[PDB]
Amino acid sequence: KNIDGYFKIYSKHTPINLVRDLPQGFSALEPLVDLPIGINITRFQTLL
Amino acid sequence: FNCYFPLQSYGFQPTNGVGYQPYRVVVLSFELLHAPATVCGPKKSTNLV
Amino acid sequence: VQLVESGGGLMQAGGSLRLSCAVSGRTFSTAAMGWFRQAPGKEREFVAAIRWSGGSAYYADSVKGRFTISRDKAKNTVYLQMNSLKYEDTAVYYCASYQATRSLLSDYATWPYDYWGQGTQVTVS
Numbered sequence A: 001k002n003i004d005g006y007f008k009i010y011s012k013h014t015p016i017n018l019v020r021d022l023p024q025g026f027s028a029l030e031p032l033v034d035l036p037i038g039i040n041i042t043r044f045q046t047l048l
Numbered sequence B: 001f002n003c004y005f006p007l008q009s010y011g012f013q014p015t016n017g018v019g020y021q022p023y024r025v026v027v028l029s030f031e032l033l034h035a036p037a038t039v040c041g042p043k044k045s046t047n048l049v
Numbered sequence C: 001v002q003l004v005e006s007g008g009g010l011m012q013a014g015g016s017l018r019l020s021c022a023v024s025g026r027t028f029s030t031a032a033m034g035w036f037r038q039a040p041g042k043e044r045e046f047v048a049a050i051r052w053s054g055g056s057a058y059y060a061d062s063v064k065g066r067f068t069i070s071r072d073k074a075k076n077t078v079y080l081q082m083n084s085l086k087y088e089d090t091a092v093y094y095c096a097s098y099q100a101t102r103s104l105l106s107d108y109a110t111w112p113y114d115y116w117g118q119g120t121q122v123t124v125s
Ligand SMILES: *[C@@H]1O[C@H](CO)[C@@H](O)[C@H](O)[C@H]1NC(C)=O
Pocket: A038, A039, A040, B034
């Protein structure tokens, strides 16, 4: 998310046993990065 | 005639007058935009009691 | 900068000869190259100067209309084409670089320069 000029990145790694969709269950994401960019963002894409 | 190069060299010799001696100059300008402020001072701490 | 002259030698009056002077190091875009000559027992005398950017040329009266100075930027070389050789033109010619960006090209006739080549002998018969 991109709020108040800060780019915040939260994440969580979990083990799973499921090949179709998102596992059902619950886990919280701890913050990883807070970037003070002040950059307007409106679009994004993924890189594989 | 009436067509000159805009620049000219400085004469910096060790024996030159202080008025004509070379001086290194740095001008620091401070900017507050619609962005996070990312250049801050040291903000010194103290001991804990 | 390092200056290396070439092209001197013996020529008959009326002939033509091309001197070369390769410029290396800090070849400034807003500098100039000049050719000067010193005859035995005489003081060094300005001959011709050319500004590196644009190639406008300035000549001493003693050589105006006879000699041409040119430079090849890509090769960082200045050339002196010595046409209509005369007895008085006999001298050692040295190529020098003007690190002083002078607005008025004619000022390079009297400016004391910074670095000097080794010299090449020209003898006019
Ligand atoms: C971001 O976009 C809004 C409107 O699209 C604009 O008012 C604002 O100046 C922009 N901010 C930056 C830092 O480009």
